[PDB]
């Protein structure tokens, strides 16, 4: 479990490349599971930036 | 014309090995017949399918 921006959610799949996949969290090529995501702007953003 | 029986056994075995070696140059619908040229130009899951 983690937060990333809505674009970078596409890197959270087996066999992807890019800095979130390659430097932050890499899924196996033989992964079994589910990737679940939702917009959290109301919780995780803040005025002045979180 | 007489020794053609023994020469044909030599020719058939040479033609069979030439056919087996020439089939390394075939694509079979892959991007390339060259195995390093697949791996050096595609991402892991795409190279795997080729």
Swiss-Prot record, chain B:
User: Impact of mutating residue 12 to H?
Assistant: In strain: Omicron/BA.1, Omicron/BA.2, Omicron/BA.2.12.1, Omicron/BA.2.75, Omicron/BA.4, Omicron/BA.5, Omicron/BQ.1.1, Omicron/XBB.1.5, Omicron/EG.5.1
Coiled-coil positions are: 7-50
Q: What is the effect of changing residue 27 to K?
A: In strain: Omicron/BA.1, Omicron/BA.2, Omicron/BA.2.12.1, Omicron/BA.2.75, Omicron/BA.4, Omicron/BA.5, Omicron/BQ.1.1, Omicron/XBB.1.5, Omicron/EG.5.1
According to the record, mutating residue 39 to F results in: In strain: Omicron/BA.1
Q: What does this protein do?
A: Subunit of the fusion protein that is processed upon entry into the host cell. Mediates fusion of the virion and cellular membranes by functioning as a class I viral fusion protein. Contains a viral fusion peptide that is unmasked after S2 cleavage. This cleavage can occur at the cell membrane by host TMPRSS2 or during endocytosis by host CSTL. In either case, this triggers an extensive and irreversible conformational change that leads to fusion of the viral envelope with the cellular cytoplasmic membrane, releasing viral genomic RNA into the host cell cytoplasm.
The name this protein goes by in its record:
Spike protein S2'
Which species is the source of this protein?
Severe acute respiratory syndrome coronavirus 2 (2019-nCoV)
> Which residues of the whole protein are included?
943 to 992 of 1273
């Amino acid at each position: 479990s983690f937060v990333i921006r809505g674009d970078e959610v596409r890197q959270i799949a087996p066999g992807q490349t890019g800095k979130i996949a390659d430097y932050n969290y890499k899924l196996p090529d033989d992964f079994t599971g589910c990737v679940i995501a939702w917009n959290s702007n109301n919780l995780d953003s803040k005025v002045g930036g979180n | 014309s007489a020794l053609g029986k023994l020469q044909d056994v030599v020719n058939q075995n040479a033609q069979a090995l030439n056919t087996l070696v020439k089939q390394l140059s075939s694509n079979f619908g892959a991007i390339s017949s060259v195995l390093n040229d697949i791996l050096s130009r595609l991402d892991k899951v795409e190279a795997e399918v080729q």
